[PDB]
Amino acid sequence: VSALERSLRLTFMDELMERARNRDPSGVSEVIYDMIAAGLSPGPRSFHGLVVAHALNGDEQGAMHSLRKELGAGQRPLPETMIALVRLSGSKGNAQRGLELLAAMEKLNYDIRQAWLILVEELVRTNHLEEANKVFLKGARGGMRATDQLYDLMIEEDCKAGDHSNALDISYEMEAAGRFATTFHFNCLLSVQATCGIP
Amino acid sequence: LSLHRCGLPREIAIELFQTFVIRGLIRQHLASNIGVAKSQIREKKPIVW
Amino acid sequence: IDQLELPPRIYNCLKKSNIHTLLDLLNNSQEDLIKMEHFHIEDVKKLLDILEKK
Amino acid sequence: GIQRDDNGRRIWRRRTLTKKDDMLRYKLQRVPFVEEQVRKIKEVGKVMTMDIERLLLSEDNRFEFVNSVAAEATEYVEKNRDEYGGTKKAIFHVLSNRVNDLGFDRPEAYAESDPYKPGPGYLKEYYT
Amino acid sequence: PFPLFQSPASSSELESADPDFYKIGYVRRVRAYGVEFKEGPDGFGIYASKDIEPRRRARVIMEIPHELMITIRQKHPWMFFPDIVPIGHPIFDIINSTDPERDWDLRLACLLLFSFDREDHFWRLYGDFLPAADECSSLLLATEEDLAELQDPQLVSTIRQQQKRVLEFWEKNWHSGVPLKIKRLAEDAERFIWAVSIAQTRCISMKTRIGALVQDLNMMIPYADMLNHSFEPNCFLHWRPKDRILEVMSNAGQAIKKGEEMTINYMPGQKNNMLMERYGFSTPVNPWDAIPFSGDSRIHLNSFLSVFNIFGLPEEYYHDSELSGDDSFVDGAVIAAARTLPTWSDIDLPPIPSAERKAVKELQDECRKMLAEYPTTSEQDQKLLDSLSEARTTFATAVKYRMHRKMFIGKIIKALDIYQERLLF
Amino acid sequence: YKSDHIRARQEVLGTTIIGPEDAPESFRLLVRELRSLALELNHFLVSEKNFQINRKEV
Numbered sequence: 041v042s043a044l045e046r047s048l049r050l051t052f053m054d055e056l057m058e059r060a061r062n063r064d065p066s067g068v069s070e071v072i073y074d075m076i077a078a079g080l081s082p083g084p085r086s087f088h089g090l091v092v093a094h095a096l097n098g099d100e101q102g103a104m105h106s107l108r109k110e111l112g113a114g115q116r117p118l119p120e121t122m123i124a125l126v127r128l129s130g131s132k133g134n135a136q137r138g139l140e141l142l143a144a145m146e147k148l149n150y151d152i153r154q155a156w157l158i159l160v161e162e163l164v165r166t167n168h169l170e171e172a173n174k175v176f177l178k179g180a181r182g183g184m185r186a187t188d189q190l191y192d193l194m195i196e197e198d199c200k201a202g203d204h205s206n207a208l209d210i211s212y213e214m215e216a217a218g219r220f221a222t223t224f225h226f227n228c229l230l231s232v233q234a235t236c237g238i239p
Numbered sequence: 240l241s242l243h244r245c246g247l248p249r250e251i252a253i254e255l256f257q258t259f260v261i262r263g264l265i266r267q268h269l270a271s272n273i274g275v276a277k278s279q280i281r282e283k284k285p286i287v288w
Numbered sequence: 289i290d291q292l293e294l295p296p297r298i299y300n301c302l303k304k305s306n307i308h309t310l311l312d313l314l315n316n317s318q319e320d321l322i323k324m325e326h327f328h329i330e331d332v333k334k335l336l337d338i339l340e341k342k
Numbered sequence: 343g344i345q346r347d348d349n350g351r352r353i354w355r356r357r358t359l360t361k362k363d364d365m366l367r368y369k370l371q372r373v374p375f376v377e378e379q380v381r382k383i384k385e386v387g388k389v390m391t392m393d394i395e396r397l398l399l400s401e402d403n404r405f406e407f408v409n410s411v412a413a414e415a416t417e418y419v420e421k422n423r424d425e426y427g428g429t430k431k432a433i434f435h436v437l438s439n440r441v442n443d444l445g446f447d448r449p450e451a452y453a454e455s456d457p458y459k460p461g462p463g464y465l466k467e468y469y470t
Numbered sequence: 471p472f473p474l475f476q477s478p479a480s481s482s483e484l485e486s487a488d489p490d491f492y493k494i495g496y497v498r499r500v501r502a503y504g505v506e507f508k509e510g511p512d513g514f515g516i517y518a519s520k521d522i523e524p525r526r527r528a529r530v531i532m533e534i535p536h537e538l539m540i541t542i543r544q545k546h547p548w549m550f551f552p553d554i555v556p557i558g559h560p561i562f563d564i565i566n567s568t569d570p571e572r573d574w575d576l577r578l579a580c581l582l583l584f585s586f587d588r589e590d591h592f593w594r595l596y597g598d599f600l601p602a603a604d605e606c607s608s609l610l611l612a613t614e615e616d617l618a619e620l621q622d623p624q625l626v627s628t629i630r631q632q633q634k635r636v637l638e639f640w641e642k643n644w645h646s647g648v649p650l651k652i653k654r655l656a657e658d659a660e661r662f663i664w665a666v667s668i669a670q671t672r673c674i675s676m677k678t679r680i681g682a683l684v685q686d687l688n689m690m691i692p693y694a695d696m697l698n699h700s701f702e703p704n705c706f707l708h709w710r711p712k713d714r715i716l717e718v719m720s721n722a723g724q725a726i727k728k729g730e731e732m733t734i735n736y737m738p739g740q741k742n743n744m745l746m747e748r749y750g751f752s753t754p755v756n757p758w759d760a761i762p763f764s765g766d767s768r769i770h771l772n773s774f775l776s777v778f779n780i781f782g783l784p785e786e787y788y789h790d791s792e793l794s795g796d797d798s799f800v801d802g803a804v805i806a807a808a809r810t811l812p813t814w815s816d817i818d819l820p821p822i823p824s825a826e827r828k829a830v831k832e833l834q835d836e837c838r839k840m841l842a843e844y845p846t847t848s849e850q851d852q853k854l855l856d857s858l859s860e861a862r863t864t865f866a867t868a869v870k871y872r873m874h875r876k877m878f879i880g881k882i883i884k885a886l887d888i889y890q891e892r893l894l895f
Numbered sequence: 896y897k898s899d900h901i902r903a904r905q906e907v908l909g910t911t912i913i914g915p916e917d918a919p920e921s922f923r924l925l926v927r928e929l930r931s932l933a934l935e936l937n938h939f940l941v942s943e944k945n946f947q948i949n950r951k952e953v
């Protein structure tokens with residue numbers, strides 16, 4: 041590797057991040073274009089700035105377009121890019137897109153669990169509780185253990201929404217995951233059972 | 240006999256394990272179907288025991 | 289091992305160890321031969337080259 | 343602590359039992375005449391009996407253990423219908439696997455053949 | 471290819487242990503499966519006698535009956551299981567006159583000395599395989615010469631604080647007026663120091679169910695303390711309550727190759743100073759060692775985590791081997807850097823490589839200062855150890871502790887170096 | 896099915912030849928006898944998931 045070769049990457053990537061952090065994917069498209077003109081092949085982190093530019097503005101279609109271009113070039117995407125993709129999908133509640141990306145990470149042999157937590161949290165954050173149940177349970181049946189906060193957050197939201205059927209199933213998964221339901225978890229379940237009319 | 244074993248006669252064992260013997264005959268292709276096996280059991284072939 | 293032109297001491301030790309066939313001799317190891325009573329390290333060397341000629 | 347000789351190699355005190363253990367000389371012997379017992383135990387099937395208890399030793403509730411065994415046995419037969427009908431039993435295969443999971447060695451499903459069976463039509467009459 | 475034609479007939483520092491060592495336990499229903507005990511200049515150790523093919527669940531490695539152990543409750547009242555102290559014995563008054571939370575080691579030392587005096591107790595035989603006062607690596611036995619060389623005012627102050635506490639406890643409870651049955655336990659002050667050193671360096675706290683009772687016991691399990699420490703253990707300790715057997719079980723689905731050492735984590739996550747204070751040893755690959763740092767400069771740890779294939783939450787930081795391919799550099803040492811280094815992160819904000827490059831050298835500009843603070847270098851200390859041929863083992867550990875800390879600073883200097891250049895790609 | 900239970904015993908041979916959820920006939924017969932005495936014996940399964948009460952037909 042030439043000494044000035046890394047300098048050219050530094051100069052290019054010192055500027056791409058500015059466009060990446062200023063939320064303008066259009067400007068980033070030329071930076072990689074002149075980077076192709078520069079002669080050196082694109083890198084996984086080169087698309088990272090392109091991906092986040094779409095993610096910051098909320099270009100879910102643009103984020104996928106940047107992803108396949110990274111795939112089209114033929115290098116493994118960075119996990120940070122993958123994590124940003126599922127988080128963007130969770131922000132818009134696109135459950136089908138989120139699970140498809142998570143399957144790619146497992147096919148890419150990455151840590152799906154940490155990204156799986158963020159996607160579930162985002163759906164709860166965006167009040168997509170029903171979709172969050174689908175994502176959380178499917179990961180729960182797999183064997184991965186969620187965080188203590190996620191179990192508390194997910195159960196409480198379901199009981200507030202009258203979703204005791206999903207909350208109880210989630211609570212059972214938590215028990216099998218190695219965490220036992222404390223008084224807090226039972227209190228959430230009782231908030232719904234007390235209204236069923238059967239003491 | 241051992242403490243955990245019991246001896247069953249052939250005519251009593253075959254009555255109790257009627258279904259399982261038929262399954263074994265079908266599984267190992269000795270009997271094509273249930274009807275052949277039941278007739279074969281009544282024939283008391285050496286394979287049945 | 290009778291047909292193998294072994295030294296008389298080598299032959300007697302193998303027979304004492306209930307080793308009669310060439311196949312039985314091959315299935316043993318050099319360590320399995322050293323542990324025999326009247327068998328030494330130099331003997332397993334001369335035993336091998338006899339088999340090598342065959 | 344660290345001690346080395348001229349050659350640079352490390353010399354350490356070989357920790358050895360200074361005193362004498364009475365039970366050491368009273369327990370290393372093995373009985374020589376249990377060949378017929380060990381063969382009978384394997385043929386009868388008592389070897390699984392010890393294994394069944396051994397699994398229960400690490401278990402918390404024996405009713406959960408049998409439910410887990412039954413659940414896993416049902417899973418085995420669903421995958422391979424045409425395997426657990428005769429000499430191999432679904433439940434015995436589970437027990438043999440669970441012992442092998444602990445790191446020990448057992449024959450698959452504790453199945454044993456009759457090496458001295460003369461002919462296909464000859465079935466071993468039991469001396470009652 | 472016949473066995474006769476094939477002629478099969480390193481690691482010289484490790485020799486097979488005395489056969490009596492396993493035999494005296496074997497007669498007491500102690501079984502070790504697929505492993506053997508080897509000893510060397512460092513000490514004992516358990517090494518696999520064969521390849522451990524992984525199974526669906528954890529594989530049993532060792533079994534220790536309860537009656538061979540010395541156990542005392544962590545919480546008052548102090549009840550001893552496999553009860554060895556007779557009712558009315560004066561040694562109980564010494565034990566009962568201890569700090570409920572600070573003197574756990576002292577209460578085990580009294581039992582340890584008491585067990586050696588008992589003729590029928592198993593530990594009077596197993597005590598011969600314990601390291602002597604000079605062989606033990608506990609810092610509690612170290613003098614000022616080793617403590618001064620340790621180069622850690624905080625750690626030295628703690629060690630010297632413990633020495634006063636232990637020595638004064640012996641003075642109070644082993645005066646001239648004690649009964650002979652108590653006096654013979656600790657004829658001199660030095661022996662009690664060794665007893666506390668063994669208790670600190672070999673206690674294994676664990677919640678065990680004995681019959682219908684569940685409690686936390688400061689246990690003294692034999693043959694299980696011999697397992698060395700590693701923050702990525704290949705086996706763990708499991709208590710089987712039905713037969714009161716402590717099972718050593720290898721991690722489920724993990725293969726152990728021939729000759730590989732079996733290790734357990736003494737503590738879940740701790741720094742090397744804690745390990746030196748408790749066990750008197752340090753590991754350069756500790757994923758919990760920290761270092762004070764100014765908060766002015768920080769980097770994007772997410773980029774730092776990914777470039778070394780580190781995933782999971784900070785509570786579960788770990789490195790992926792197959793993703794990195796070989797990556798001989800990455801170990802547990804760099805994982806600690808992911809925690810102790812000042813870092814910044816937003817939802818998805820990408821970092822500025824130039825700003826980080828502006829800061830990586832600035833970060834490394836500070837990193838050269840701590841190494842300059844210690845007069846010796848990392849290679850200077852290990853070179854001295856090879857040249858050294860007559861010194862206490864605590865001196866070597868004190869050398870190792872500062873060497874590991876210096877390398878931990880040296881490791882992160884290289885870690886930031888590779889991270890800085892790899893950020894461009 | 897190893898008793899007076901027509902539905903289960905009908906296919907229990909065939910499950911063991913190739914390789915419940917309903918009340919037994921005795922209980923169903925018991926209901927009719929109580930049903931003949933102007934007594935309505937009802938078996939409900941209140942669900943533990945969503946508290947959905949369903950009447951098990953007897």
Ligand SMILES: Nc1ncnc2c1ncn2[C@@H]1O[C@H](CSCC[C@H](N)C(=O)O)[C@@H](O)[C@H]1O
Nearest residue numbers: 513514515607671695696698699749750751
């Ligand atoms: N991972 C490790 N690295 C270095 N020393 C270790 C170690 N694990 C244990 N030790 C040593 O063992 C002591 C704890 S007791 C463990 C038994 C000891 N290894 C023996 O051979 O008898 C520590 O004080 C240290 O001296």
